[PDB]
Design an enzyme around this catalytic site. Structure first.
Site, PDB file in Angstrom:
ATOM      1  N   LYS A   1     -23.267  -0.041   4.328  1.00 54.69           N
ATOM      2  CA  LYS A   1     -24.714   0.002   4.143  1.00 54.69           C
ATOM      3  C   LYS A   1     -25.425   0.387   5.422  1.00 54.69           C
ATOM      4  CE  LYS A   1     -24.242  -3.607   0.731  1.00 54.69           C
ATOM      5  NZ  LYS A   1     -24.943  -4.813   0.233  1.00 54.69           N
TER       6      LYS A   1
ATOM      7  N   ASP B   1     -25.163 -16.361  -1.119  1.00 54.43           N
ATOM      8  CA  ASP B   1     -25.735 -15.413  -2.074  1.00 54.43           C
ATOM      9  C   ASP B   1     -24.671 -14.708  -2.947  1.00 54.43           C
ATOM     10  OD1 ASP B   1     -27.438 -13.814  -3.438  1.00 54.43           O
ATOM     11  OD2 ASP B   1     -27.482 -12.333  -1.856  1.00 54.43           O
TER      12      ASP B   1
ATOM     13  N   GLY C   1     -32.326  -2.604  -1.967  1.00 54.30           N
ATOM     14  CA  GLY C   1     -33.176  -2.008  -3.015  1.00 54.30           C
ATOM     15  C   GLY C   1     -32.348  -1.035  -3.817  1.00 54.30           C
TER      16      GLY C   1
ATOM     17  N   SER D   1     -24.326 -10.784  -2.416  1.00 53.49           N
ATOM     18  CA  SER D   1     -23.596 -10.374  -1.239  1.00 53.49           C
ATOM     19  C   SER D   1     -22.308 -11.171  -1.280  1.00 53.49           C
ATOM     20  CB  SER D   1     -24.420 -10.798  -0.033  1.00 53.49           C
ATOM     21  OG  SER D   1     -25.804 -10.808  -0.345  1.00 53.49           O
TER      22      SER D   1
ATOM     23  N   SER E   1     -31.307  -9.654  -1.307  1.00 56.42           N
ATOM     24  CA  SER E   1     -31.095 -10.932  -1.976  1.00 56.42           C
ATOM     25  C   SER E   1     -30.602 -12.038  -1.027  1.00 56.42           C
ATOM     26  CB  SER E   1     -30.142 -10.787  -3.158  1.00 56.42           C
ATOM     27  OG  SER E   1     -28.881 -10.348  -2.727  1.00 56.42           O
TER      28      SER E   1
ATOM     29  N   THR F   1     -27.340  -8.221  -1.509  1.00 59.58           N
ATOM     30  CA  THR F   1     -27.265  -7.520  -0.206  1.00 59.58           C
ATOM     31  C   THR F   1     -27.912  -8.397   0.838  1.00 59.58           C
ATOM     32  OG1 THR F   1     -27.143  -5.148  -0.771  1.00 59.58           O
ATOM     33  CG2 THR F   1     -28.329  -5.707   1.134  1.00 59.58           C
TER      34      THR F   1
ATOM     35  N   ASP G   1     -23.719  -6.821   4.706  1.00 57.51           N
ATOM     36  CA  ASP G   1     -22.532  -7.217   3.947  1.00 57.51           C
ATOM     37  C   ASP G   1     -22.006  -5.937   3.363  1.00 57.51           C
ATOM     38  OD1 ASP G   1     -24.695  -7.065   1.894  1.00 57.51           O
ATOM     39  OD2 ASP G   1     -23.087  -7.629   0.515  1.00 57.51           O
TER      40      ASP G   1
END
Ligand SMILES: [Mg+2]
Ligand SMILES: [Mg+2]
Ligand SMILES: [Mg+2]
Ligand SMILES: [Mg+2]
Ligand SMILES: [Mg+2]
Ligand SMILES: [Mg+2]
Ligand SMILES: [Mg+2]
Ligand SMILES: [Mg+2]
Ligand SMILES: [Mg+2]
Ligand SMILES: [Mg+2]
Ligand SMILES: [Mg+2]
Ligand SMILES: [Mg+2]
Ligand SMILES: [Mg+2]
Ligand SMILES: [Mg+2]
Ligand SMILES: [Mg+2]
Ligand SMILES: [Mg+2]
Ligand SMILES: [Mg+2]
Ligand SMILES: [Mg+2]
Ligand SMILES: [Mg+2]
Ligand SMILES: [Mg+2]
Ligand SMILES: [Mg+2]
Ligand SMILES: [Mg+2]
Ligand SMILES: [Mg+2]
Ligand SMILES: [Mg+2]
Ligand SMILES: [Mg+2]
Ligand SMILES: [Mg+2]
EC number: 3.4.25.1
Lengths: 221, 125, 196, 222, 233, 212, 196, 204, 196, 196
Positions: free
Chosen positions: A33, A166, A47, A169, A129, A1, A17
């Site tokens: 999100k 990442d 989280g 994501s 992340s 994320t 994302d």
């Protein structure tokens, strides 16, 4: 994320994302999100995703109620205080990490909140992340007195850092823009760089392909 | 450390230390074996150069290797004891790993192989 | 553990040894002999960890067989038992210890006595009129202490044993699938053709 | 305490055609949630018309590939430049792996080529070298996402002839290398979508009587 | 080494049209004590290779000594040590990757992550990574430690693919790298303002730059940050 | 996994499933769990796949050397004992195996030895090994007769594995069958448990509870 | 973090770095660790951020209420309240706090409440990870009744060193000056203090 | 030791054009030991369908519980609950047990009777709305389901084609899971009617 | 664990339940009944941890008895089993969980069917034609799968069971000291006089 | 312990406290942690006493032998030897050593070998538990090419502070002065240095 938050001269914008994962599996390719706490206060979470939903719903509700009591537009700092006091109470067992941003009558605001109940104020922030990819971009391009259109471009680029670099994501980029004058603008899938190519083949089956033992009609009525 | 090559070829193609070993056999007391329809018999001579011999304790010339195989010899007696110990151990080991006693052929083949090794290794005669 | 019993009567030694072998959840076999004959008048029964028990017994066996051939003579039961104890006592401070317990019953042709030796995996040896390994003693010693007389016949010995096995069938959680019984006497070693 | 292992994976796939064989893998190499490379190839030609891949912990996989190639080269010296038959290569690889039975190579290995009748062949190994001739096998991260798909679309597993109610099983066909390659690319685009460690690039090595041929396809980069 | 003591942080690097660039700060830390400031973690080998090292510094210093001695031994009975048979990057790397995998495999690792950057006698860029597990890989960009997390993202904005390497000049590449060092300075608590940077260009050869400092930092905005929530003054 | 083997008037039957599993994930439905040591001797694979396959193949090499040296087929006694002895040398290192060594020699007749990595080696007439084990035993224990026809012995072996494949999650795929005679073993084919199940239910009446 | 408070002739100054780390990642490079609990009573926070923010928020609450009812509280009273929270909840708090304030009766006062909740009144106090590196320097350079400019320097130099050596400290140096005059916030940036 | 892997089982749901489909295996296990082949994991409350994988005691309990609550709901609103709303209900009911939860993976399917929309959703064990138009999966073979589904699915399947697809997706996944199988059932749901089919599969 | 079997034939339900109770090393008793009658046509057998098993059964019993008196009516076997499942499902999230597994066999007078319910200590309930708890299934399910027909007589049921107990005596390491068998039919509950 | 070495114009000075603790008990209050390995090459020891004594003993040996063969060794060579022992045996040593010496080509040189065995040449170096407290003070007060009398003061003051704060440091302050002139030992007692 990857989620970020960037102030600009007339307000504030947040972005996120759209991937959500259970271990190395992607359970949802287009998860939103960006959560509303009240019309002009929005929120992004990382989280435990059940904890960030639960805690934005709950505070959203106490805020609405408190707003109705006071006959006043709700303030970000109230969302902040209510969040943090609850997270602190639960000693970090509620795995919610948030960037909350919004406009209220005192001006425009941007805060982050950690699961244990600490909070930061800033002009630009990231979490998740993808946090470090995003921050590298913000640290490279942020300047003071961004126009709105620069802030969106910047926040959008920051999330892209997370998407590409990442594995936590992402897929698309969501954005919400909160300008001091106006209605909050929420741009679901503002950016969608990640479309699946047409497959080499169709896997539609010839009908009757599957073996069957029984049919029943079922009772709704 | 001592690995001097003692059994080597001489120019006529012979291996003198092995041939000299046969000379020791030729000097040893006569032994003989003959096979029946279904016995085998082993007979051997004693020396009579000395006759205050305690015949019950003095080593016999025929030895059991297992309960079904015997071995007799001519030549150096001290040397015979070492072949016999090795053979007896091989027999017990063979029971252990294959769950059968040795064939006579096998046990012969074993002993011969020991004898042969000693014609081709440094430090030994 | 499995069941390892022994008793020394007047003219012989009786060894009783459980038939079951079980691997975890299943009983693999109900007819296993937990003895090896070491020489015509010397018998060793054994129990303890898998693999180790047999490997150890078959190794002791081959050593005693080697001795007999070499000397054309049969070691006394006392000597065999001292040899075995020493081997177990080396195992204990070794890299991987043999976890095996044994009983050695022999008839000593030279003294015309039967002898029973109990040796555990540590090398703890002791000569006894009756013995057992593991929990087997717990059920049966009460009865032996009571009934045992040094002058028992073989038949009396086998009765006394029948009673012990009954006590074990009654009170012991494990089904050890009966016992095989052997007798070591002046004429050697034979197996009692049936028991329950 | 030092842990000597890691996981870079990695997904690989090998299919035996009837006069050919393919072996494919993503080209992406990862650590935790980071990408290290978007192009770090993991399927290799080792000659004697044999392709190999050792997926899992990249260092152990590299060591193993090195060692195997060196085994090929020494087979030549030692056996009069004889060609190494795929079944012999497999045996040889069981020995390399089992050599490290007590500190294993932490990899899932697959090889591909032609058996001694020119039929397609694939062998798959565990990390300590149990091994199996197999008609198709996926390896690494997204193997659980792929094998069911192949069970279905290669073996026509759970498929029946309309209209009989599962009394007549749908019959099997031989698959053109072109057909097999579609299923490969489709397996990988699916896996890329749903497994975070899969993406970036797809490399395929194709083995035919006429040698080894490589083929590459972009994959999505999130 | 079973647990690292004095440590160096991120090495970062990228390749551009004619060579490669690599950089690393001049710090050896001792946990959170920033102990040693004058530490060179770029190790040039010949005039076509620079090896950059992070992780345990005692091990780095051991690796330095192996590299000196590789240069010395390659010169032995080698009339062409300064010519066709000098050391290439690809050789130095294979050697290091061998050693690392070997030390790992004896459960006694060299507690490092290394990047070998260079230009091959045939003109080609070389950039490969190996670390304490013996793991290796190549990419148009490479970084250790934090750099993997913050520097790669930025350097990949310049060279996202192979095809972009020809398009990327040494001015652009260098400015990208310097910016990354500034980012890491801002955000790696184990990092230093001072650093070294090296360029290996297939025409200009090896340019090694000591004693750089991160410049053009933004902090002013910090004056308007008050409290952590609701405090106004 | 389920593996079994038994002795009867017509030699030995050996039967095994073919499923390999990693946790819940079913790695393969097609593992050969019978190792063909040579054309006269069979082994079965349970516990470690590699450990069995590697050491039983090695056993084949040892048995061959025995025959070149001694000019005589190796006994199953001796073949099993070579493998148990090797295995015991590794005891404690974490080998994992449970196997039946099956053969039929003139001197011994049909003989089966169970060998495992504990060191254990056991002569017997019936063994099953694996997570499906207890299921197989039930069928076999209530049908086994010494003088089964070979055709019925093969069926019994197949039905005992099927039992286990059905109840045990860790067993299934297909059954493999072997008949071991004095002249060697005969493969009696591979049978998908999917198709075999239904067939047996219908033909035999059994598996009543399953809806078919 | 590195934090201090120093009494001087005209009142008292508090300083701190501005770095917040989660391991080696700098979560926030412009933190405000100087926190107001009353007009002229402030504190320095070290330890857990969650714990110290939450505590400070409560103290502020108590003193707002004190004030409503009994007028302006003493710096000592404010330290009492911090202490009472820290001592009584020692088992679940990780908070190291320096309290400082000014009134006319007492000019500047500094109290430090380390872990465990003991309280200690002092002419100056230092704390946070960075403090260990400057015990020597501060003991050597602090004198009582310095001027404001002297004291801003003493702080600036003490913290420039704490920052230099401690990885968990860095960023800008903030101060807050407390005197009859009022309340002055100060900031000093890297290019200033690194160079000292 | 893992409660979500003792009894085993899977559920998958997907959408087509003006219809939704939902399916489960039938296996109740207890580790290696198959126990029942008649453990349906799909329940319904009016025209809302709920699949539940995970610890079976909890599957049962949750069903008993949502039957209870949708009963009280109908009695008071005087109308059957719709899927969007049920979903929220499931979610809030699980999060009540946040620090001691039910070990399950629910899946909701149904057609909204007012709007006519196909709707599906899933959750973790503490109740985060994983909402997706295309498909949802849960259970001990969720990986294999994700794989089948991502390849097999295409949008807007007519009901009889959707059946074929979801069936295949389920079966071939259960066949690569030790702890699923032993039969299977599939519901096809259209606005005015619902047909339920049992599938023929391998039994091992 | 102990042995808990049950089978539902055509007109009744048969419960077979091991007689042994063992406490560690001794078998304390060889004649224990692991059942309680819950109402005239409903029988519950049980096994699991000591104390818990009985306490739980006797508590279920008293509750069903209370119900019967209050309503002058006998709950269906289905209802009893749902009640029991719910109790066990409360136990698992309780402070100390009941570790008990049960089978409930009943004759349902209203539908004139026999019914068998299997419920483990987690509250996992399932209706089956035959069942068992613990390892008992592992030995016996092979045989039941094969031989079971829904139209079996009580006599056939008892034969099929005899075969199951033999398989257990053969392959199972523990001596469970035989079984007590009961039948639940339209006329109620009786115990088979002898399982010789 | 607290230890340092400092280069100055005429050569180099080493200093140290003189306390050795086992927990809180001061085992020895007059330790000599300044240890000669050659005429004009000395070291400062910290870490384990056994380890640093045993190492210093070996280095001295190597350099006695070096000397016998190649004449007087360079300070650098001595640091090489310490490093090689410390690096190559890191897994079972706890030693933190400062090496210092003087020759005419190079005047004073200081090398520090912290834990792990890395080696670092420096203008000055500090170490031991007490060192953390004076990083700030030393960075602020060291200048190159001080006089002898300045450098003795810089050391005296640095160590007086290290001692003041560190409980594992105390006693007298010893120094050793290394110049063309020769070798001077110095001692300073509590009544001098506490008072600074
Ligand atoms: Mg969502
Ligand atoms: Mg021997
Ligand atoms: Mg020799
Ligand atoms: Mg005694
Ligand atoms: Mg017992
Ligand atoms: Mg690992
Ligand atoms: Mg080899
Ligand atoms: Mg891109
Ligand atoms: Mg490292
Ligand atoms: Mg060389
Ligand atoms: Mg080397
Ligand atoms: Mg600025
Ligand atoms: Mg070995
Ligand atoms: Mg089991
Ligand atoms: Mg603290
Ligand atoms: Mg509190
Ligand atoms: Mg701190
Ligand atoms: Mg309720
Ligand atoms: Mg109403
Ligand atoms: Mg709760
Ligand atoms: Mg409940
Ligand atoms: Mg639980
Ligand atoms: Mg030290
Ligand atoms: Mg040196
Ligand atoms: Mg030493
Ligand atoms: Mg140490």
């Amino acid at each position: 994320t990857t989620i970020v938050g960037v102030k600009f001269n007339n307000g504030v914008v947040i972005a996120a994302d759209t991937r959500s994962t259970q271990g190395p599996i992607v359970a949802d390719k287009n998860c939103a999100k960006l959560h509303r706490i009240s019309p002009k206060i929005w929120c992004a979470g990382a989280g435990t995703a059940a904890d960030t939903e639960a805690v934005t719903q709950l505070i959203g509700s106490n805020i609405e109620l408190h707003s109705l009591y006071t006959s006043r537009e709700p303030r970000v700092v109230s969302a902040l205080q209510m969040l943090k006091q609850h997270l602190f109470k639960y000693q970090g067992h509620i795995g919610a990490y948030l960037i909350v941003a919004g406009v209220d009558p005192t001006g425009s605001h941007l805060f982050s909140i950690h699961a244990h109940g600490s909070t930061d104020v800033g002009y630009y922030l990231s979490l998740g992340s993808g946090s470090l990819a995003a921050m590298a971009v913000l640290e490279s391009h942020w300047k003071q007195d961004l126009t709105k259109e620069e802030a969106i471009k910047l926040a959008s680029d920051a999330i892209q850092a997370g998407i590409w670099n990442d594995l936590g994501s992402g897929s698309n980029v969501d954005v919400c823009v909160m300008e001091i004058g106006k209605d909050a603008e929420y741009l679901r899938n503002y950016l969608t760089p990640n479309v699946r190519e047409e497959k080499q083949k169709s896997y539609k089956f010839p009908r009757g392909t599957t073996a069957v033992l029984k049919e029943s009609i079922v009772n709704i009525c | 450390g001592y690995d001097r090559a003692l059994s080597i070829f001489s120019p006529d193609g012979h291996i003198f230390q092995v041939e000299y070993a046969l000379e020791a056999v030729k000097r040893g007391t006569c032994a003989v074996g003959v096979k029946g329809k279904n016995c085998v018999v082993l007979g051997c001579e004693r020396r009579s150069t000395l006759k205050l011999q305690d015949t019950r304790i003095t080593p016999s010339k025929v030895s059991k290797i297992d309960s079904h195989v015997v071995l007799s010899f001519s030549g150096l007696n001290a040397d015979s004891r070492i072949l016999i110990e090795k053979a007896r151990v091989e027999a017990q080991s063979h029971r252990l790993t294959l769950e059968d006693p040795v064939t006579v052929e096998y046990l012969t083949r074993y002993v011969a192989g020991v004898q042969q090794r000693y014609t081709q290794s440094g430090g030994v005669r | 553990m499995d069941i390892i019993l022994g008793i020394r009567v007047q003219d012989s030694v009786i060894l009783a040894s459980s038939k079951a072998v079980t691997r975890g959840i299943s009983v693999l076999k109900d007819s296993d002999d937990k003895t090896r004959q070491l020489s015509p008048h010397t018998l060793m029964s054994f129990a303890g960890e898998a693999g180790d028990t047999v490997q150890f017994a078959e190794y002791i066996q081959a050593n005693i067989q080697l001795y007999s051939i070499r000397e054309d003579y049969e070691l006394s039961p006392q000597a065999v038992s001292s040899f075995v104890r020493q081997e177990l006592a080396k195992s204990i401070r070794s890299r991987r210890p043999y976890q095996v317990n044994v009983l050695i019953g022999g008839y000593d042709k030279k003294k015309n006595k039967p002898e029973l030796y109990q040796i555990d995996y540590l090398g703890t040896k002791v000569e006894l009129p009756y013995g057992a390994h593991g929990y087997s003693g717990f059920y049966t010693f009460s009865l032996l202490d009571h009934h045992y007389r040094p002058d028992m016949t073989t038949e009396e010995g086998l009765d006394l044993l029948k009673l012990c096995v009954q006590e074990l069938e009654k009170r012991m959680p494990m089904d050890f699938k009966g016992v095989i019984v052997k007798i070591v006497d002046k004429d050697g070693i034979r197996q009692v053709d049936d028991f329950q | 305490q030092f842990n000597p292992y890691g996981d870079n994976g990695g997904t690989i796939l090998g299919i035996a055609g009837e006069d050919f064989a393919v072996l494919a893998g993503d080209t992406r190499n990862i650590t935790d949630y980071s990408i290290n490379s978007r192009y770090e190839p993991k399927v290799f030609d080792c000659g004697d018309n044999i392709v190999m891949s050792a997926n899992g912990f990249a260092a152990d996989g590299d060591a193993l590939v090195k060692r195997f190639k060196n085994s090929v080269k020494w087979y030549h010296f030692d056996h009069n430049d004889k060609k190494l038959s795929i079944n012999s290569a497999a045996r040889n690889i069981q020995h390399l792996l089992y050599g490290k039975r007590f500190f294993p190579y932490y990899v899932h290995t697959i090889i591909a080529g032609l058996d001694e009748d020119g039929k397609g062949a694939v062998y798959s190994f565990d990390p300590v070298g149990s091994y199996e001739r197999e008609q198709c096998r996926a390896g690494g991260a997204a193997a659980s996402l792929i094998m069911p798909f192949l069970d279905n679309q290669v073996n026509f597993k759970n498929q029946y002839e309309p209209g009989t109610n599962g009394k007549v099983k749908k019959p099997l066909k031989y698959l053109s290398v072109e057909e097999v390659i579609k299923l490969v690319r489709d397996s990988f685009t699916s896996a890329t979508e749903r497994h975070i460690q899969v993406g970036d690039g797809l490399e395929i090595l194709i083995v035919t009587k006429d040698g080894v041929r490589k083929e590459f396809y972009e994959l999505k980069r999130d | 080494t079973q647990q690292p003591i004095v440590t160096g942080t991120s090495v970062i690097s990228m390749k551009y049209d004619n060579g490669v660039i690599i950089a690393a700060d001049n710090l050896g830390s001792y946990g959170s004590l920033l102990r040693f400031n004058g530490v060179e973690r770029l190790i040039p080998v010949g005039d076509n290779t620079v090896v950059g090292i992070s992780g345990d510094i005692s091990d780095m210093q051991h690796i330095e000594r192996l590299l000196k001695d590789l240069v010395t031994e390659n010169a032995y009975d080698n009339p062409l040590a300064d010519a066709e048979e000098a050391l290439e990057p690809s050789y130095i790397f294979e050697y290091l990757a061998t050693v690392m995998y070997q030390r790992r495999s004896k459960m006694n690792p060299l507690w490092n992550a290394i990047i070998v950057a260079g230009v091959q006698s045939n003109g080609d860029q070389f950039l490969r990574y190996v670390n304490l597990l013996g793991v290796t890989y190549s990419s148009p960009t490479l970084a250790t430690g934090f750099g993997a997390h913050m520097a790669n993202p930025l350097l990949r904005k310049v060279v996202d693919r192979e095809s972009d390497i020809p398009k990327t000049t040494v001015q652009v590449a260098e400015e990208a790298i310097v910016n990354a060092m500034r980012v890491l300075y801002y955000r790696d608590a184990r990092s230093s303002r001072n650093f070294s940077l090296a360029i290996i260009d297939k025409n200009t050869g090896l340019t090694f730059k000591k004693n750089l400092q991160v410049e053009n930092m933004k902090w002013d905005f910090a004056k308007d940050i008050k409290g952590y929530g609701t405090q106004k003054i | 996994t389920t593996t079994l083997a038994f002795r009867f008037q017509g030699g030995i039957i050996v039967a095994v499933d073919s499923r390999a599993t990693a946790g819940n994930w079913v790695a393969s439905q097609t593992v050969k769990k019978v190792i063909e040591i040579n054309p006269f001797l069979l082994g079965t694979m349970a516990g470690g796949a590699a450990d069995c396959q590697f050491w039983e193949t090695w056993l084949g090499s040892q048995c061959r050397l025995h025959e070149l040296r001694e000019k005589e087929r190796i006994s199953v006694a001796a073949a099993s004992k070579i493998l148990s002895n090797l295995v015991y040398q590794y005891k404690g290192a974490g080998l994992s195996m449970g196997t039946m060594i099956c053969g039929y020699t003139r001197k011994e007749g049909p003989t089966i030895y169970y060998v495992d990595s504990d060191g254990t080696r056991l002569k017997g007439d019936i063994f099953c090994v694996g997570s499906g084990q207890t299921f197989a035993y039930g069928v076999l224990d209530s049908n086994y007769k010494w003088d089964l026809s070979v055709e019925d012995a093969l069926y019994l072996g197949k039905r005992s594995i099927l039992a286990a494949a059905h109840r045990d999650a860790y067993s299934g795929g297909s059954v493999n069958l072997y008949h071991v005679t004095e002249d060697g073993w005969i493969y009696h084919g591979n049978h998908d448990v999917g198709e075999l199940f239904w067939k047996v239910k219908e033909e035999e009446g059994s598996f009543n509870n399953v809806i078919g | 973090t590195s934090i201090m408070a120093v009494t001087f002739k005209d009142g008292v100054i508090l300083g701190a770095d501005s770095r917040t780390t989660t391991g080696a990642y700098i979560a926030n490079r412009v933190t405000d660790k100087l926190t107001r609990v009353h007009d002229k009573i402030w504190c320095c926070r070290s330890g857990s951020a969650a714990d110290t923010q939450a505590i400070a928020d409560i103290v502020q609450y108590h003193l707002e209420l004190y004030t409503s009812q009994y007028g302006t509280p003493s710096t000592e009273t404010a330290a009492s309240v911090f202490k009472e929270l820290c001592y009584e909840n020692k088992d679940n708090l990780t908070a190291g706090i320096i309290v400082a304030g000014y009134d006319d009766k007492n000019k500047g006062e500094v109290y430090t409440i380390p872990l465990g909740g003991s309280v200690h009144k002092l002419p100056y106090a230092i704390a946070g990870s960075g403090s260990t590196f400057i015990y020597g320097y501060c003991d050597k350079n602090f004198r009582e009744n310095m001027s404001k400019e002297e004291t801003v320097d003493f702080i600036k130099h003490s913290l420039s060193q704490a920052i230099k050596w401690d990885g968990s400290s860095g960023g800008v140096i903030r101060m807050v000056v407390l005197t009859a005059a009022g309340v002055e916030r100060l900031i000093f940036y890297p290019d200033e203090y690194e160079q000292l | 030791s893992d409660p979500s892997s003792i009894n085993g089982g899977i559920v998958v749901a997907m959408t087509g054009k003006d219809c939704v489909a939902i399916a489960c295996d039938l296996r109740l296990g207890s580790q290696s030991l198959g126990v029942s082949n008649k453990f349906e994991k799909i329940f319904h409350y009016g025209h809302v369908f709920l699949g539940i994988t995970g610890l079976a005691t909890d599957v049962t309990t949750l069903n008993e519980m949502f039957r209870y609550k949708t009963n009280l709901y109908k009695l008071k609103e005087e109308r059957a609950i719709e899927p969007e709303t049920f979903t929220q209900l499931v979610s809030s009911s699980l999060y009540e047990r946040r620090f001691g939860p039910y070990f399950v993976g629910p899946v909701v399917a149904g057609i909204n009777s007012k709007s006519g929309k196909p709707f599906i959703a899933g959750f973790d064990l503490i109740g985060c709305i994983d909402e997706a138009k295309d498909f949802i999966v849960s259970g001990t073979a969720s990986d294999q389901l994700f794989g089948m589904c991502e390849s097999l699915y295409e949008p807007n399947l007519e009901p009889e084609d959707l059946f074929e697809t979801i069936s295949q997706a389920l079966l071939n996944a259960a066949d690569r899971d030790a702890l699923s199988g032993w039969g299977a059932v599939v519901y096809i749901i259209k606005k005015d009617e619902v047909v339920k089919r049992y599938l023929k599969m391998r039994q091992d």
